[PDB]
Design a protein around this ligand. Structure first.
Ligand code: HEM
Length: 396
C-alpha cells in the first residue's frame, strides 16, 4: 500500500507518469522516498496543497531533528534556515528579506539586469553561431544577479556554485561530498556575514546584518544561513528555468512565432510556461502534522510527515481546464511553481524579472534563433533534484 518513489523520472520535460497517476487515482497517498526513514503522505491536488501549505497545523519547525523522507542523502535544509521556521516567527524574517524585492526595488534592478543580459548576448554574438545557450546565458545570468546583490567577489562565484550543486545531488555515494560542501559553504558565509555585521557596507548582507527591532532580527548563525540560502536559491532554479523555457520555446514553433509577432504577450506567456514546465524531480521539504487532521477525508496522524507536489497541483483539472495544454490565453489562475502559503518563494519577483529581461531581449536580438540539434539530442540532467538541459546548442 506504500508506493516506491525514487522520483528519478528524467525524460525531457515530460510530466512524471507516476505523479500523474497519483494525482488522478490516489491523490492522498503513502510513499517511501530514496532517503530518510519511514513513510510520508503525498498530497497532490491543488486544493489540498493549498491547505497543507497554509493550515497552521502543518509545521516546518517540527521537521527539525527528523530524518525526514527526502530526495538527497544529506538534507539541503539547515537548522537555522527560514525554510524550517513557522509563522509568526517566519513572518518577521520573510518580511525583512521581502523588503529587498519590493516592486520598486526589482524595477530599479531591471536596468542593471538589462545591461548584464545585453553584455552576455553581445559576447555570444561575437563568438558566432552556434553556441551553447546554457554556458552563454542561462548559467551566468542568475549567478551574476544574486552575487551582485550579495556583493560576492567574482573570484569566489564558481566555487560557491560548485558547492551548491554538490548539495543537490541525489546519488547515495555523494552524501559525504554533500556534507562537506554544506559545511564549507556554511563556513564561507559565517566568515563573510560576520565581517559585514562588524563593518557594514551598502550590500544586501550588510542590510540583513544591521536590521534591528530592539535586538538584531537575525542572530549570528541565522544571518550566516540566510546569506547562504539566498546564494543557493538565487542561482539554481532560475538558471534551470531559463534553460527549460528556452528549450520549450525552441521546440514549440507556433508558440515562439506568437511571441515574435506580439512581444507584449511575454509576461502572460511566461506565467503559463512556469505553470506547465516540470522544473523539479519529485518533492522538496515536507511538513509535520502537529495533531490529528482529516485532510480531504484522510486522517493524518500527529507527527506524520506530509509532502506536497506543486507540480501535480499545477496539472489539477479541478483548477486548470485542459491542464496538460500549454495555453498562454487560458484564464489566469495562480500557479504553484513559486510555492504557496507561508513559505512562498521570496525571490519570485526577482526571478520573474530575470526571465522577462532575458527572453524579451533574446527574442528581439536574435530573430532567427533556433535549436541547433534535433530536440531528442538534447541531454537532460539525471543527477540533481532539478530538471534542466545539460546544454542547449542554438544557432541564429
Ligand atoms: C524560476 C525561479 C524560482 C522558482 C521556480 C522558485 C520556486 C520556489 C519554491 C517551489 C519554493 C518552496 C516553497 C515551499 O517550501 O513550500 C521556493 C522557496 C524559496 N525561494 Fe524560490 N524559486 C525561484 C527563484 C528564487 C530566487 C531567485 C530566490 C532568491 C533570490 C529564491 C529564494 C527562495 C527562498 C529564500 C525560499 C524559501 C522561502 C521560505 O521558506 O520562507 N527563489 N522557491
Amino acid at each position: 500500500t506504500v508506493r516506491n518513489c525514487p522520483f528519478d523520472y528524467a525524460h525531457e520535460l515530460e510530466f512524471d507518469p507516476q505523479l500523474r497517476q497519483l494525482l488522478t487515482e490516489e491523490p492522498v497517498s503513502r510513499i517511501r522516498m530514496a532517503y530518510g526513514e519511514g513513510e510520508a503522505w503525498l498530497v497532490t491536488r491543488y486544493e489540498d496543497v493549498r491547505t497543507v501549505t497554509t493550515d497552521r497545523r502543518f509545521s516546518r519547525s517540527a521537521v527539525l531533528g527528523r530524518d525526514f523522507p527526502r530526495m538527497t542523502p544529506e538534507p539541503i535544509v539547515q537548522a537555522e534556515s527560514i525554510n524550517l521556521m513557522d509563522p509568526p516567527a517566519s513572518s518577521r524574517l520573510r518580511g525583512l528579506v521581502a523588503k529587498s524585492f519590493t516592486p520598486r526595488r526589482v524595477e530599479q534592478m531591471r536596468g542593471g539586469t538589462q545591461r548584464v543580459v545585453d553584455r552576455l548576448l553581445d559576447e555570444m554574438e561575437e563568438e558566432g553561431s552556434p553556441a551553447d545557450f546554457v554556458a552563454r546565458v542561462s548559467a551566468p545570468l542568475p549567478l551574476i544577479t544574486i552575487c551582485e546583490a550579495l556583493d560576492i567577489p567574482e573570484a569566489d562565484r564558481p566555487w560557491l556554485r560548485a558547492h551548491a550543486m554538490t548539495m543537490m545531488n541525489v546519488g547515495a555515494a555523494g552524501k559525504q561530498d554533500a556534507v562537506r560542501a554544506k559545511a564549507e559553504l556554511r563556513g564561507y558565509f559565517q566568515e563573510l556575514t560576520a565581517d559585514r555585521r562588524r563593518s557594514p557596507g551598502e550590500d544586501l548582507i550588510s542590510t540583513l546584518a544591521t536590521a534591528r527591532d530592539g535586538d538584531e532580527l537575525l542572530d549570528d548563525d541565522e544571518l550566516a544561513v540566510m546569506a547562504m540560502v539566498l546564494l543557493i536559491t538565487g542561482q539554481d532554479t532560475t538558471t534551470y528555468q531559463l534553460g527549460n523555457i528556452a528549450y520549450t520555446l525552441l521546440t514549440r514553433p507556433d508558440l515562439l512565432r506568437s511571441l515574435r509577432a506580439e512581444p507584449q504577450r511575454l509576461p502572460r506567456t511566461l506565467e503559463e510556461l512556469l505553470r506547465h514546465i516540470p522544473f523539479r524531480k519529485g518533492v522538496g521539504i515536507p511538513r509535520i502534522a502537529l495533531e490529528d487532521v482529516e485532510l480531504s477525508g484522510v486522517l493524518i496522524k500527529a507527527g506524520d510527515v506530509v509532502h506536497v507536489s506543486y507540480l501535480t497541483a499545477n496539472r489539477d483539472s479541478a483548477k486548470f481546464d485542459r491542464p496538460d495544454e500549454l495555453d498562454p490565453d487560458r484564464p489566469t489562475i495562480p500557479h504553484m511553481t513559486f510555492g504557496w502559503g507561508a513559505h512562498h518563494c521570496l525571490g519570485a519577483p526577482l526571478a520573474t524579472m530575470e526571465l522577462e529581461v532575458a527572453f524579451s531581449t533574446l527574442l528581439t536580438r536574435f530573430p532567427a534563433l533556433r535549436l541547433d540539434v534535433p530536440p531528442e539530442d538534447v541531454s537532460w540532467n539525471t543527477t540533481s533534484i532539478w530538471r534542466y538541459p545539460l546544454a542547449l546548442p542554438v544557432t541564429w
